[PDB]
């Protein structure tokens, strides 16, 4: 998990999802792209 | 494709159906690239590149085009039945070539109507000029 | 052809022009020729869409004000300093 203030799509497969009031990036292709805004 | 290119394509098919009387039908549910390339090579070695495999048989594309002439093709729109026109020669021999195409490893999806150019039935007409 | 619907400005000045620009309009003026200048108010969105075109500043424009067509050309435009907005337009009678 990357915990950042600026969470971005890092490739095609990253998806922005708002879970429990938190913006998150979930990537099927690349676990390194998993992001969590915080 | 924007409407203009669609209009040129529809004019092209209307011109081709006007120019050539005979044609054949084909539906590629399990139509392999091998058999498709063979049907192309067939047309090429017989004559020029005018012969195509064009898959333009929509309910509003070929069905819109046919009211010019061969209005009987309007009913054919349903269930994805394609066309292959044939300009020169009286009753060319490429009707039966699709019969062999279906015979050799195809799921039999085309169903070979033959569109009754001589106003015949759907069953194969093996009689042709020789 | 661009046709721009306009009204004659009832009141003029700094506060009145602020009020127009707040109410999604903007001032403009037609001058040129022996006719006295005409101060008009324009709908901002319509004219912004029009002037997005490059020929807005080249062709001849028709402003319809009080049911009267006037042939003009966009002489100068005042743009908002940092917004995609128009503050004022000069039309010269064509």
């Amino acid at each position: 998990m990357k915990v950042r203030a600026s969470v971005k799509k890092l490739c095609r497969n990253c998806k922005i999802v708002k879970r429990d009031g938190v913006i998150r990036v979930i990537c099927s292709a690349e676990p390194k792209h998993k992001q969590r805004q915080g | 494709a924007l409407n203009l290119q669609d209009k040129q394509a529809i004019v092209a098919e209307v011109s081709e159906v006007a120019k050539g009387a005979l044609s054949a039908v084909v539906a590629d549910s399990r139509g392999v690239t091998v058999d498709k390339m063979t049907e192309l090579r067939k047309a090429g070695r017989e004559a020029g590149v005018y012969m195509r495999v064009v898959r333009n048989t929509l309910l509003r594309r070929a069905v819109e085009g046919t009211p010019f002439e061969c209005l009987k093709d309007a009913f054919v729109g349903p269930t994805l039945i394609a066309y292959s026109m044939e300009h020169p020669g009286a009753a060319a021999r490429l009707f039966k070539e699709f019969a062999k195409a279906n015979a050799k490893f195809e799921v039999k999806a085309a169903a070979f109507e033959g569109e009754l150019i001589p106003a015949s039935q759907i069953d194969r007409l093996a009689t042709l000029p020789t | 052809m661009f046709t721009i619907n306009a009204e004659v400005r009832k009141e003029q000045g700094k506060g009145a022009s602020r009020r127009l620009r707040a109410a999604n309009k903007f001032p403009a003026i037609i001058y040129g020729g022996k006719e006295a200048p005409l101060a008009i108010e324009l709908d901002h969105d319509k004219v912004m869409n029009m002037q997005a075109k490059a020929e807005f500043y080249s062709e001849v424009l028709t402003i319809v004000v009080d049911g009267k067509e006037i042939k003009v050309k966009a002489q100068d435009v005042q743009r908002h300093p940092y917004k995609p907005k128009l503050q004022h337009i000069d039309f010269v009678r064509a």
Binding site: - | - | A54, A74, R79, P81, Y82
Partner: protein
């Protein structure tokens, strides 16, 4: 790091930075980076943005810097009382009003200019926006 070659005076009053800017239209290039916000750009910041955008455009096309840092900014050294004269000039700033075109660029496509100006704007303290040449 831009800086006046000479200045008629060495130090300058703090002044104020009210009002809207003057260089508001894209004048030299095809695309411009305009200041929406208000503030002062240091010579270092201007240099950093120029480097970022130059590297983004791959040293292709042309870039104008429409702001020049001409106001010297003084600082007192650490651990010094409040009197004892004005502090030493440490850097130079350009006062920026909303609407000021900061950089201009052309010879590149509009998307490449947008990307270059985005990277450049990341290096600036004031909020900016992308603008294009307008006929009139």
């Amino acid at each position: 790091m831009l800086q006046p070659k000479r200045t008629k005076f060495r130090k300058m009053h703090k002044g104020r930075n009210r009002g809207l800017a003057q260089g508001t239209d894209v004048s030299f290039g095809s695309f411009g980076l305009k200041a929406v916000g208000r503030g002062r750009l240091t010579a270092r910041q201007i240099e950093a943005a120029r480097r970022a955008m130059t590297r983004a455009v791959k040293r292709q096309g042309k870039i104008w810097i429409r702001v020049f840092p001409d106001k010297p900014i003084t600082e007192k050294p650490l651990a010094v009382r409040m009197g004892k004269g004005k502090g030493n000039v440490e850097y130079w700033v350009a006062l920026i009003q909303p609407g000021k075109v900061l950089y201009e660029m052309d010879g590149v496509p509009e998307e490449l200019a947008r990307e270059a100006f985005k990277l450049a704007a990341a290096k600036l303290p004031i909020k900016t926006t992308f603008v294009t040449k307008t006929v009139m």
